[PDB]
Amino acid sequence: QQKKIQMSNLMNQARLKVLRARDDLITDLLNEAKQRLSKVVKDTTRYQVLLDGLVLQGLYQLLEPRMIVRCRKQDFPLVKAAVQKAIPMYKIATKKDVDVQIDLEAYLPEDIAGGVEIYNGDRKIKVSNTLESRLDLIAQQMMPEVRGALFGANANRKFLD
Amino acid sequence: YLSQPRLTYKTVSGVNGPLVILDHVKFPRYAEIVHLTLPDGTKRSGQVLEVSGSKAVVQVFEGTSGIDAKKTSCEFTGDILRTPVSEDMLGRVFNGSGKPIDRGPVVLAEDFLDIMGQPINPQCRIYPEEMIQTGISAIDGMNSIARGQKIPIFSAAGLPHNEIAAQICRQAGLVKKENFAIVFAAMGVNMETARFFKSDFEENGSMDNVCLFLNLANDPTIERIITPRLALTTAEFLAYQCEKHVLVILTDMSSYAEALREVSAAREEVPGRRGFPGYMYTDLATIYERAGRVEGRNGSITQIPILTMPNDDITHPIPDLTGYITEGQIYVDRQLHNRQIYPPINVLPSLSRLMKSAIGEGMTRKDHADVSNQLYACYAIGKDVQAMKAVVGEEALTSDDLLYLEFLQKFEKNFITQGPYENRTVYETLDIGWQLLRIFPKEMLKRIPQSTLSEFYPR
Amino acid sequence: YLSQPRLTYKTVSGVNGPLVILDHVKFPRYAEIVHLTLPDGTKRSGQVLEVSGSKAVVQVFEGTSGIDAKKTSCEFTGDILRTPVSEDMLGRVFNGSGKPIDRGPVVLAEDFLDIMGQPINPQCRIYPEEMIQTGISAIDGMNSIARGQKIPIFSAAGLPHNEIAAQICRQAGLVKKENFAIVFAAMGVNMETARFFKSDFEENGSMDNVCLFLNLANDPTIERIITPRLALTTAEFLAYQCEKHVLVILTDMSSYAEALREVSAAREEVPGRRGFPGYMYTDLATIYERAGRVEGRNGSITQIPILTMPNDDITHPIPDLTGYITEGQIYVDRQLHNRQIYPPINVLPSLSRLMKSAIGEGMTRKDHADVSNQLYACYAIGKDVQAMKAVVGEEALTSDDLLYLEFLQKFEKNFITQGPYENRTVYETLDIGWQLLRIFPKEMLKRIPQSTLSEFYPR
Amino acid sequence: KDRIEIFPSRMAQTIMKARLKGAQTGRNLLKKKSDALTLRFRQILSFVTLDEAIKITNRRVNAIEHVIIPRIERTLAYIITELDEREREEFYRLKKIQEKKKIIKEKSE
Amino acid sequence: GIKMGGLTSEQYHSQVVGKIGYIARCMQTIDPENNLKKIREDYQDVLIWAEKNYRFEEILEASKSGKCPNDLDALSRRSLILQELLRLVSSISPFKMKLDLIESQYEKMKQHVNLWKSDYHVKLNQLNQLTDYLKNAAPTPKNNFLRAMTSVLQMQIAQYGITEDNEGINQLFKLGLHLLAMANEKIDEQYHLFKGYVKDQPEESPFEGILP
Amino acid sequence: TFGYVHGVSGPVVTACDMAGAAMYELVRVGHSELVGEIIRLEGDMATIQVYEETSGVSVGDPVLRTGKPLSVELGPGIMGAIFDGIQRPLSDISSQTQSIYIPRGVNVSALSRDIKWEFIPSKNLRVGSHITGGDIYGIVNENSLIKHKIMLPPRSRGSVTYIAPPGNYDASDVVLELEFEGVKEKLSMVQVWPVRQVRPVTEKLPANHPLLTGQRVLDALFPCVQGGTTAIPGAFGCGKTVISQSLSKYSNSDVIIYVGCGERGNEMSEVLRDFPELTMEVDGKVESIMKRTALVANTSNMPVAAREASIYTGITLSEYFRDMGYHVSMMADSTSRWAEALREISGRLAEMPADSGYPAYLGARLASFYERAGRVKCLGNPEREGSVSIVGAVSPPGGDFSDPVTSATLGIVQVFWGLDKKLAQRKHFPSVNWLISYSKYMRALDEYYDKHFTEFVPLRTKAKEILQEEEDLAEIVQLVGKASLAETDKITLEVAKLIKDDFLQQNGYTPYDRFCPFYKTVGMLSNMISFYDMARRAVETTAQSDNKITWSIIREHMGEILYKLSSMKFKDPVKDGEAKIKADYAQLLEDMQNAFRSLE
């Protein structure tokens, strides 16, 4: 009688063991991706293009009469250019005159790979537009395709509807 | 995917019980999921119930204690509640929110489904056919469950509805004259019973084919509402996309109904009949009717909702509104329980409207229908004779009456009484039936054709 | 008269159920009529049930389906629904809105009367002291009808209350040993019922003295609560200005009550019983009390507000509130109908509150009152005997009880049963009464004095 | 008389349903007693004692069927109706409370 | 809401204009040569409004003003009679009916209390059932028998009419309808049924000169 | 034509910038085009009741205003299709998506626009002619059974300016153009009619023609008439299938409409699976029932607006064909399911409840529903006639008759075909209760019966008297055992059994008894009642003294006659023609009278 219970516990824990191992593979892959993105932000021209995009997308989502851009101190020269470009593009697209300032007193922690945060005039609304947040957001939304690519498709799934 | 950075708001207009009222929110959605961060670093989840312009109203899943109107931040996801589903999640145990509580990893999704889903297009619905045997004779040889029907277990409070539900999960399967799974959702379950389900499923080796959702009595009441939707959302994925048959057991729908009333009050809706929302009817149908067979696919979903009857009154809106939209009933009694009969299921008031199609040659055995009808009449007569005996005495009875009393006593002792760990297949249940029927001479078995008797009656 | 031009508005504030709310209205008048045109040219009307400042709430008769908010054009007539009335309305057929539906012209008014009417000064109201001979023994004997009396027939769905009312229309005369103008309000009925009465009135050769108002089951439910007022308003013209004796019959008043209940719910008024407005009694009195003779004028109005009793419940608010207002009821039931007894009139729960003055010396025959009272005693006792005998058996009865069963059996088939075209006089009815009373010995006829028994009983 | 005259309540509803079940069981058990006596009576046809026993049992059964249960059913239906009437007045008050709250909120804006 | 019968004020007069135009169309369709002088006269009050361009609106005003015969019930009965006469001659279109018989049948209908429920109406409904079926029918013994028998039936109606009851026509109606309802799979029964007709017909060559 | 969403409080959506909107108009809310209706209006804002789930709807979403209120799309292609309660083709949704679900915000046109229909003009109309509402200007050839007549939409008239020539047209083309007072209207083959509006007719006529169902019971004793309204109880064991199949397969109506209101998923599947497999002989060919049927399917989890609207969608489709001159028979699978949907909406709108929790207007809605049925004189110059019958079922919770929905229905319908479960348990079909069932059209049909059959009426009167007496004698038999019983009562009991066994009982699974023509039904009853009278006379005229006739003598003496009477149901109308069956029944009548004659 007790032998049956022992077999159940061994098989059930064995299933969890392999599932945890698969979750470690995903975790390690995401950590490697973060290191690869760190290598990207070490660039200059490619990173400035990312900043041009990130600032524009932040501004378009917040749509406030006044905005403050907060960034890592070492990235200020590049963000300055990104804001100067984002402003005339924003105004044309939205037809709203928004005063966009950069925060020169507070800066993002230097351990963040890169990206920006966008605050409204009273600093009560913030846009989580850093690179690490965007990567985590996309990695989860696209995760079903990661599963299949790495470990194979579900052989028992016949209808995708 | 959206690939749009999330907005986090620190603007709070006020907090009122379970609700947090936000301000200056950009294009909020109804039913949007948000996450709160309290000043102590504590995180909470919630869902937007009303969006009146920029005034979004969010119900917090956990308690609202500790939330202020100055520092608490609200992160919006930009989307609604969509459950990650996969085949691998079968064999896992989750809480009401869909999070693992079995020390395993988070589900690695194959897709994301809206838990509310859609109604199944009736043009592609297939009438129920084959049977799914439960292993419990009282509901295999008397009121079997067709492969596609929805038949509830009504019980009074205090009866062993949870022990039977667990037994069905351990024993249920196909007739076998690898493609069968059970999805079990317990709403409002107390800690002692929740442990019972988790441990009993793991120990007996059944977990490989069970997806278990536990929503505890002290868990958020809103999570109790999605719990049955998550269970069915998984069932729909497993059944219709992965070509397999799924048995879904929804335990304590009465506790769900109470959680639904709480949500209605949060919306300041005027209560309807007996305090319940006027839309309780469609809400139960929304859950119950996400089942059955579909054209062109080999999967199926069945349901066995289990409901506690308040004050043991079948008239109460909960069992009344349920039964009105389900196909028959199992009905667990109290007299059989007090007499120490397990399972305590009373065959006379029970009914399975689809049994006519569930059983018969090619699905169970040729004689299934005939044995059931004769046993039912014999039990009904035995009860009638027992009532007579109590008035006229034993000496006033004739031989035929004594045979019915012998059947009545041995029927309950051998056929209905089973034990929680004896698994009686459909063929053993019928053989037990014949052992009781061979008490009577052939001429008294009026409901069994002579051809059936000549084949099965002897030996 | 009103010489100033009426104003037209496009200022509708909003629409909530059957009520269209206007703003920016100049000096709104309470209970004034508004005509409105929909964007597609449809014309509808309604009444202002509330005014406040520049706002007014208009209840639309035809309905609010298709009512716009920007293009809707409304004009205020500047007065209350005063309706055209003329003598030559007799022989015309109108709808529930007061318009002709017989392909004849509109009413060429002799005057305009306020549909709301006025209460008759109780100092000039003259107590009814004349009897109408209905020809039905069940009525003329035990529940006489006076000219100016209010007597509805309490009935139930499926019973021939329409045949009884039709019969009364043809064979209703006087006991002074006469052509009544009939106003028939057919509201909440199907085509066949309205055609039944219209055909019968022509078959009787009396159509030139009949004014019909039709509002059928497929017509608006709000017009169903002015149709009675339109019928009675015409009756008042004929009776009190042209000294014509008028018989006003209102079909199932329960369709009036249901139409009123819908309006009460729409306006969120204080309910009383079964969801009906707490003012249901006052509203019914406004309709019912438009009856009776007036001193110094030779006209009269007699009403028969027949109503269907929901689920045969004699305590339902409709028959209950009516019973409090009208001078008793005729009341038919299913126990007589289910035995093919016509007319199926049950005298026991019935009464006529003017009978005591319309019968006896100088009116019918001096023994009238005595015969009726004893027949009531014998009939009720016979019913009591059946209630006993159903349990104790015939062998438990004595000769004193069998006499009441003999009376009851002969009473129902000789006194109540007549047939649709059996027209008996009041004198024949009393003679029949005696034939049944002579079943008992003098000593048992305890409601009749010996000063009456000694003269009539021996014959 | 017509009703047991128990004030409308959920407690009374529960009691009447239990009382009705008891009355129905008594009717059936006494009917079976009568049927058993009737069979023995017809088989014999200590005889007059059976004729009295049958009439006495049938009289009690008839009273349950024609007097006691009808009265329980009328009482139960009365209770059910009165309970819905109480539910309605609670609904009415709650509706007006919700409307008054909405009106108060608009004034504050 | 004048609601004259089932119609409102505008609908009532619109239906009157329609029925008048319809009669004019039926009269020209049934008698394009204006040969049926007696029948046309019975409709002069509605044909006088024909052959004029009123753009609907001017004849509609004439109806509202009362210049047209705007009684809806009189037009309903009179229109039905004319179109039932059209069915009589239309359903036998392969054959010509004598003008005297057309007027005779017309007068018998005009005198009928309730033409819609007459045996005349039913007989035409059975005929149209049989002649509509054959409009789109495959070659096969059954359909060849029905087509041959229908041509005789149409020939006889053209000569006797329908109101003038004739045992010969009535018997042919029964045989045609009985064949029509007969199972398509059964061949021997429909063969024997047709042969019964051919041998029982009083003449020797029932179809000679009737069909090609 | 667009507004914007101002806010969402659940299933209720508040719109702004929506000034140009009418109450009970239609809107398509959000980017998924969710179906809903406008109920309350205030200023330029509107309150929208959304039928489907509102999850995901944002503030600022568009709202598309649709000018027409809830309406049914009427035109070619309606036949053979299965619709949602708000007129959404389920057979196209499941086939254009390859899904098993009804998509949220699904927008499939009620009638497909890719079919090239065969259209033939009337050939009587010309350009410049006058046409009015209800006029027919051409016919579409759909199938071998039902011609789909194209009528001018009601509330339209004018001069014809264009008539399409005969040819192949789809539902998006222009077939007829007409001008009224300078305004030109271009009409296709499809018309739209608000579902809550009653389609006008010229006049509403009395119903006099019987509804010729194939059952001996539910015809001889309890007649229904074309245009009449009846109710049928719907319980698991009542055997309602017999009426549904018998009515849909062999009825003398032209078009069958089956309306679900909000039943169990598996029950909707059973109807959808059974119907396509039903056939009937027509012109000697076996045709599928779906060529002359339309079906509306609604399960309990469908949007409540559809479940409530389903009943009116069905009857609107019914009236559409009624206006063609067809006789239409509509069955509502459960009017209790509809009433439940209606109560739910009243609850959502926080309306004050009335009787047993139902809306105060429940009765008014049911009364106006059934009033729409009946025989009518159609609109249009063709002077055609038709009818709509309703055979809606009732299934109150608990099986009681106290529920306002069943009580109100019984006060409206003129025929009640009360079914029972005990009869089904006894294997006696059709399961007709007899004592509860009634018909109030017996007088209306007396003219038909007198004109065509003459003896039918006294026979059905005697038959009910015999059956009622059999019930009345039940107490005497129980206390007696047919010993101390009159011989005349023995005739009643034993003959009543004969009636119950070999007349009122009918076995629809036998090829000879699939459908009993009326002339056979009255033939069978005539001989049984003639026997009854002969047996009564044989006993009564000889019951004085010395030499009397008893039932034991009659039964033993002429047992072959009782057998021949029982054998009468086996006269297969498919093989034995009208003359042969009548001839055989005449022979039994003669043999029967002579059998009694030999006793005197």
CA distance B304 to B135: 14
C-alpha closest to that of F352 among F360, F340, F344, F363: F360
**With contact defined as beta carbons under 8 Å apart, do F543 and F482 qualify?**
no
Q: b/e for C88-115, b at 16 or more Cβ within 10 A?
A: ebbbbbbbbbbebbbeeeebeeeeebeb
Domain limits of chain F?
1-70, 71-114+188-439, 115-187, 440-600
Whether F333 has a binding-site annotation, put simply, is: yes
Backbone angles phi, psi at C79, to 5 degrees: -150, 175
Distances (CA, A) of C408 to B28, C440, F173: 78, 12, 76
Q: Do chains C and A touch (3 or more CB pairs under 8 A)?
A: no
The two tokens of residue A8 are 């159940």
Q: Of C418, C396, C414, which is closest to residue C406 (Cα–Cα)? A: C414
Phi, then psi, of C102 in degrees rounded to 5: -110, 20
Give residue for tokens 């996400």: B290
Q: Does C63 touch chain E (CB under 8 A)?
A: no
The answer to whether D95 faces chain B, any CB pair under 8 Å, is yes
B390 reaches D (C-beta below 8 A)? yes
> In sequence order, what are the residues at sequence separation of 6 or more whose Cβ sits closer than 8 angstroms to the Cβ of residue F180?
E56, E57, F156, F157, F158, F159
Q: Is residue F204 marked as binding?
A: no
Q: Nearest chain F Cα to D88, which residue?
A: F353
Give residue for tokens 């009427």. Answer: F74
* DSSP code, position F541: T
What is the maximum alpha-carbon separation in chain B? 87
Q: For chain E, give me the number of helices (H) and strands (E)?
A: 10, 0
Closest CA to C82 of C226, C224, C240: C226
B250: which residues sit within 8 A by CB, 6+ positions away? Answer: B185, B187, B228, B231, B256, B287, B303, B304, B305, B306
Phi-psi category of residue F586: left, alpha or beta, with phi > 0 → left and psi -120 to 50 → alpha: alpha
Cα C426 to Cα C174: distance, rounded to the nearest angstrom: 10
A161 touching F (Cβ < 8 Å): yes
Listed by start position, the domains of chain A span 34-148
| Per-position DSSP letters for B228-259, written without gaps between them | HHHHHHHHHIIIIITT-EEEEEEE-HHHHHHH
Q: Which CATH superfamily is domain A34-148 in?
A: ATP synthase, E subunit, C-terminal (3.30.2320.30)
d(CA E118, CA E107): 14
| F506 labelled binding-site residue | yes
Q: Is residue F460 helix, strand or coil? A: helix
Residue A50 to residues A78, A140, C187, F218, F343: CA-CA distances in angstroms? 10, 21, 77, 81, 57
Tracing tokens 């009015």 back to the chain, one arrives at F132
CATH code at position B308: 3.40.50.12240
Q: Report long-range pairs for A35-40 (Cβ below 8 Å, ≥24 apart).
A: A37/A113, A37/A114, A37/A131, A37/A132, A37/A135, A38/A113
For chain C, what is the HEC assignment?
CCCCCCCEECCEEEEECCEEEECCCCCCCCCCEEEEECCCCCEEEEEEEEEECCEEEEEECCCCCCCCCCCCEEEECCCCCEEEECHHHCCCEEECCCCECCCCCCCCCCEEEECCCCCCCCCCEECCCCEEECCCHHHHCCCCEECCCECCCEECCCCCHHHHHHHHHHHCEECCCCCCEEEEEEEEECHHHHHHHHHHHHHCCCHHHEEEEEEECCCCCCHHHCHHHHHHHHHHHHHHHCCCEEEEEECCHHHHHHHHHHHHHHCCCCECCCCCECCHHHHHHHHHCCCCEECCCCCEEEEECCEECHHHCCCCHHHHHHHHHCCEECCECHHHHCCCCCCCECCCCCEECCHHHHCCCCCCCCCHHHHHHHHHHHHHHHHHHHHHHHHHCHHHCCHHHHHHHHHHHHHHHHHHCCCCCCCCCHHHHHHHHHHHHCCCCHHHCCCCCHHHHHHHCCC
- B392 and D87: CB-CB below 8 Å? no
Both tokens of B219, joined, read 């868990």
Residue F332: CB atoms within 10 Å: 27
| Interface contact F202-E6, CB threshold 8 A | yes
DSSP state of B41: S
Partner-chain contact C100 E2, CB within 8 Å: yes
Tokens of F342: 């209606």
In this complex, the residue of C270, C271, C391 whose CB is nearest that of residue D59 is C391
> CB pairs below 8 Å between C and D: how many?
24
- At residue B233's C-alpha, the angle toward residues B232 and B234, to 5°, is 85
Count helices and strands (H / E) in chain D: 3, 0
Alpha carbon separation from C216 to A118, C96, C192, C380, E2 (Å, rounded): 68, 8, 10, 39, 14
Q: What residues in D contact C387, CB-CB < 8 Å?
A: 66
B440: Cβ–Cβ under 8 A, 6 or more apart, which residues? B378, B403, B407
A158 and chain F in contact, CB less than 8 A: no
Q: Which of B197, B236, B191, B190 has the alpha carbon at shortest distance from B213?
A: B197
The residue whose two tokens read 């003219």 is F447
- Residues F21 and C66: their CA atoms lie apart, in Å, by 9
Query: In a mutagenesis test of the C interface, which of F12, F371, F479 is the best target, namely the one with the most C β-carbons within 10 Å?
Result: F371
State the Cα torsion C18-C23-C26-C29 to the nearest 10°. Answer: 30
| Strand blocks (E) in F269-321 | 279-281, 286-288, 293-296
Dihedral of the alpha carbons of B214, B215, B217, B218, in degrees to the nearest 10 = 110
Distance CA(B285)–CA(F304), nearest Å, equals 11
Put simply, the chain C residues between 349 and 388 with a CB less than 8 A from any chain D CB are 387
Residues with Cβ within 8 Å of C387's Cβ and at least 6 positions away in sequence, in order, are: D66
Compare CB distances from E4 to C62, C97, C101 and report the shortest one's residue: C101
The answer to whether the CB atoms of E3 and C103 lie below 8 A apart is no
With tokens 């100092």, the residue in question is C123
At F187, is the secondary structure helix, strand, or coil?
Answer: strand
- E11 CB neighbours in chain C (<8 A) are none
CB contact under 8 A, B29 and F268: no
Name, in order, each residue with C-beta under 8 angstroms of F152's C-beta and a sequence gap of 6 or more: F131, F132, F133, F134, F135, F136, F137, F176, F178, F187, F380
3-state SS, C200-252, equals: HHHHCCCHHHEEEEEEECCCCCCHHHCHHHHHHHHHHHHHHHCCCEEEEEECC
Residue written as token pair 């030499």: F547
Which residues form the domain of C381?
Answer: 1-459
- Statement: F71-114+188-439 belongs to CATH 3.40.50.300: yes
CA distance E194 to E179: 8
Whether A131 and A111 have beta carbons less than 8 Å apart is answered as: no
Assigned token pair, F528: 């049984």
Q: Is B353 annotated as a binding residue?
A: yes
Checking DSSP bridges between strand F158-163 and strand F147-151, what pairing results, if any?
unpaired
Chain C residues within 8 A of D58 when measuring between CB atoms: 393
Longest dimension (CA), chain C: 86
For residue C223, which of F364, F409, E8, F200 has the smallest C-alpha distance?
F364
Binary contact (D94, B270; C-beta < 8 A)? yes
Decide if B105 contacts A19 (C-beta within 8 A). yes
Closest to B352 in 3D by CA, of B105, B126, B128: B128
Cα-to-chain-centroid distance, residue C338:
25
Number of domains into which chain B is organized: 1
Inter-axis angle of helices C253-266 and C227-236, nearest 10: 120
- Residue F67 annotated in ligand binding: no
Pick the CATH number of F115-187 from 3.90.1150.10, 3.90.78.10, 1.10.3210.10, 2.40.50.100: 2.40.50.100
In whole angstroms, give the CA distance from residue B68 to residue B50: 20
Is the Cβ–Cβ distance between B229 and B115 less than 8 Å?
Answer: yes
Q: How was this structure determined?
A: cryo-EM
Quote the minimal CA–CA distance from F180 to chain A in Å. Answer: 49
In the complex, which subunits touch A with 3 or more CB pairs below 8 angstroms? B, F
